[PDB]
């Protein structure tokens, strides 16, 4: 059992029956920590309702996004096992499990962090894949070999050293890793690569175009 579930477990018994479900929606309900790190003014952790709008979460408890609300590029909830959310989606979507599944991103644990317009999101996600290469065992051949390919391919996409058939093959391998492992670290290595290919396709195209125009 997780420490949040254990720590909430005495107050459920000593306080009212189903009073905990008076916070938010009906299925996914209660209070949750939200941890807002990254490119926000005064990054911190708070307790809030489970159901809460994301813009109110970011602005009204932890400063503001550096340079106004319009300066942010993307927001990853959950942490490293969740695909990203572009700005036009996170203008509306609240912080619930089923709502983020309707936005096709599995909510992890509370790591609602942002990344700025002036930051290489390809570099950040490639370093996140280097994190998964550093911390993963090697029982399964799929996550081992696939995290190997995804790290080498994301390094080549940071340098922009390929052609768009390679980014389609990255989509193919990120389909093939997910759902064929022991644990959820393989699926968690497959999701953010999928979210990057879903949402920030033309920036990868621009990077590879820049490297082609310079190398040629």
């Amino acid at each position: 059992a997780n420490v949040e579930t254990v720590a909430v477990s005495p107050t459920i018994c000593r306080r009212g029956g189903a009073w905990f479900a008076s916070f938010g929606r009906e299925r996914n309900s209660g209070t949750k920590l939200f941890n807002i790190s990254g490119h926000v003014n005064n990054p911190c952790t708070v307790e809030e309702e489970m159901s809460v709008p994301l813009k109110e979460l970011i602005e009204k408890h932890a400063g503001g996004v550096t340079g106004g609300w319009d300066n942010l590029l993307a927001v990853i909830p959950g942490g490293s096992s969740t695909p990203l959310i572009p700005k036009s989606v996170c203008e509306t979507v609240l912080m619930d499990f089923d709502a983020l599944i309707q936005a096709q991103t599995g909510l992890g644990t509370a790591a609602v962090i942002v990344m700025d317009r002036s930051t290489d999101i390809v570099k950040a996600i490639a370093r996140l894949i280097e994190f998964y290469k550093h911390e993963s065992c090697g029982q399964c051949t799929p996550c081992r070999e696939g995290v190997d390919w995804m790290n080498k391919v994301m390094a080549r996409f940071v340098r922009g050293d390929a052609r768009p058939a390679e980014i389609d093959s990255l989509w193919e391998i990120s389909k093939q890793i997910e759902g064929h492992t022991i644990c959820a670290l393989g699926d968690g290595a497959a999701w953010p690569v999928q979210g990057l290919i879903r949402h920030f396709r033309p920036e990868l195209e621009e990077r590879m175009q820049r490297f082609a125009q310079q190398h040629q």
Binding site: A165, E166, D168, S169, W171, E172
Partner: protein, 56 residues
């Protein structure tokens, strides 16, 4: 070719085909050997993210 006129005329007269233009000795339209090196194309395979072998 490169023969004189009289035996050319007797070849043309003993067989009326005007034999000089087509005579089956190849002189200049032998294909020039040591051609430039070729790049060979690849057909409907090798396209990434569709080549599941279960399909074909």
């Amino acid at each position: 070719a490169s023969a004189t006129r009289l035996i050319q005329g007797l070849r043309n007269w003993a067989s009326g085909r005007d034999l000089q233009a087509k005579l089956q000795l190849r002189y200049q339209e032998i294909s020039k050997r040591t051609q430039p090196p070729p790049k060979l194309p690849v057909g409907p395979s090798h396209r990434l993210s569709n080549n599941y072998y279960c399909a074909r």
